[PDB]
């Protein structure tokens with residue numbers, strides 16, 4: 001994994017002084033420096049003729065080096081492309097698959113990926129539309145007992161539960177080709193504001209804990225094998241909220257295990273796997289602020 005502890009990780013005390021020395025504008029400038037760096041890798045496949053219409057945004061292609069390839073077939077007329085990238089987690093290879101919100105012409109590709117990668121948990125961080133801007137297609141059956149057929153894959157809704165900050169949907173994926181069934185849990189975070197970033201990270205971090213626990217539970221009940229299937233995480237382009245969710249998970253994981261973390265390191269590293277991760281300086285600043293807010297809630301900060 002590219003996410004290893006350090007070099008030069010910081011303690012909470014050190015992070016506090018770090019952010020205080022730079023202030024909000026200093027953190028914003030730091031994001032711009034990351035932003036300016038030349039991407040590490042190429043985007044030929046994502047921009048190649050034939051895969052263009054599979055991208056929700058022409059300005060958000062995925063890296064050739066880390067893209068998730070579909071093991072489709074010949075004749076059926078299609079490609080092995082999907083705008084999705086394997087992303088490492090804290091001391092864990094391929095902990096996530098960051099991807100865009102599925103398009104009607106990619107719904108089947110999305111589920112094929114979920115099946116092939118043996119995914120057990122899907123994390124959605126947006127609504128279908130926000131402020132008139134489309135961000136995700138309705139790729140799953142919304143109500144209990146409803147089902148959608150995607151060729152040889154049938155997805156059925158086994159139950160829905162609305163929480164104060166997220167919605168949990170249990171789905172059954174039936175592969176008629178292999179004659180096998182699997183259950184996947186779909187989580188939709190509901191508290192990310194239409195504008196800006198969350199005013200408090202408490203709900204997002206609690207949601208992360210729920211996701212972590214379900215992945216752990218699902219893994220414990222799955223058949224012997226991915227070294228731990230990846231968690232699919234998506235937002236409109238699969239870089240902003242997706243990058244934030246994943247960066248926080250990684251930083252908090254290191255913080256829990258060693259009491260240290262490095263936002264700059266984590267984000268720089270993540271951008272070499274899911275290009276363009278963290279889309280605005282506000283989101284970047286939010287990563288720092290969320291960690292500091294978490295520290296205060298955990299009683300780790302003296303003013």
Ligand SMILES: COc1cc(CC(=O)NC[C@@H](NC(=O)[C@H](CCCNC(=O)c2cccc(I)c2)NC(=O)[C@H](Cc2ccc(C(F)(F)P(=O)(O)O)cc2)NC(=O)c2ccc(Br)c(C)c2)C(N)=O)ccc1O
Pocket residue numbers: 028029032039056057058059060061126135235236237238239240241242276279280281
């Ligand atoms: C610090 O000073 C400040 C600076 C700002 C400016 C700012 O943030 N704005 C940046 C803007 N980002 C942008 O432009 C990005 C571009 C992504 C990076 N690519 C490249 O650039 C690129 C492309 C090809 C090759 C190479 I090498 C690089 N585009 C976008 O903003 C969106 C895609 C997008 C990304 C993220 C999100 C999200 F955050 F909401 P999410 O959490 O759901 O994912 C939503 C949508 N793009 C599009 O709408 C779109 C679609 C089709 C076509 Br053709 C084009 C040209 C654009 C954004 N997302 O906002 C604002 C306030 C400040 O204070």
